[model samples]
Target: MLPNQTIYINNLNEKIKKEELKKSLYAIFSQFGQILDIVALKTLKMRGQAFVIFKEIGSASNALRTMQGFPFYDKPMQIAYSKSDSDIVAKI
Candidate 1:
């Protein structure tokens, strides 16, 4: 419900390779702040979605605000604050 260190993104291009997707996401989101990790999977349920974990909430907030509807790999990237804290974020 509130901003957090993890950002949720969807509407990605599923045709893109998973590694490439994660790499591109990292390159984009890292501009906002230090990135802890990026979780992206190619499974049927997870395709076109990813989680970008930042080191600070401010960074995540900036990314979520600025990156919403960003056109990525021929698709619009929908971004928002994650609903739940990631385990890595929880440990921080």
Candidate 2:
């Protein structure tokens, strides 16, 4: 259940640099809660996807509700309850 507090964000525009995307995501997502961690994979297979972990479950839930389908990097961002193990997800 704790792992569910993390979000799997997808549908990112590959054109944006990873660092810029992280900054943009941090600026926006930080509004919802205390962010514990953010992860962006460099592998092509994992590009355009990232993980966001929140300190509280309520914040995670609220973020999902507010950010779903929101526009980012010229694309509609997609968010979902992540399957990542909390221990690993948060350590990033």
Candidate 3:
């Protein structure tokens, strides 16, 4: 079985909306492979934070290596492993 790789995205541009964020994520993930699931944060205002799950860990790693710092939607993208639920909840 393949090991799991988590990715955290926190540096999205201010202008990126929910739909645009999802599309950008889909584009990047599709290039690597199929996506398993996607979980996005819901905020009263707007925040570009989301979790993208890929079928294979390799694909997730590849995406992290290549997609980070890449320009998407006119803004640089940030990719990394997702934090623990405790950390995430604390931030929320």
Best by TM-score: 1
Residue by residue across 1-92, what tens digits does model 2's lDDT show?
A: 44367888889988888888888899999998799888886776667888888998888889998999998877999988876675344534
Clashing pairs in 1: none
Better of 2 and 3 by TM-score: 2
Instruction: Write candidate 3's Cα lDDT for 1-92 as tens digits.
Output: 23355566766765766777787688777887778766566584327667777787787888888888887777777878665545445535
For model 2, what is the C-alpha lDDT against the true structure? 0.82
Candidate 3, residue 72: Cα displacement in angstroms equals 1.5
TM-score of 3: 0.73
Where does candidate 2 stray beyond 4 Å?
1-3, 84-92
lDDT of 1 at 48: 79
Sorted on lDDT, highest at the top, how do the candidates line up? Answer: 1, 2, 3
What does each candidate score in C-alpha RMSD? 3.6, 3.1, 3.7
Sorting all predicted structures by TM-score, with the top scorer first, yields: 1, 2, 3
Show model 1 residue runs off by greater than 4 Å.
Answer: 86-92
Better of 1 and 2 by TM-score: 1
In Å, residue 4's CA in model 3 sits off its true spot by 3.1
TM-scores, one per candidate: 0.89, 0.85, 0.73
Best by lDDT: 1
Looking at model 2, report the run of 10 residues with the lowest lDDT sum. 83-92
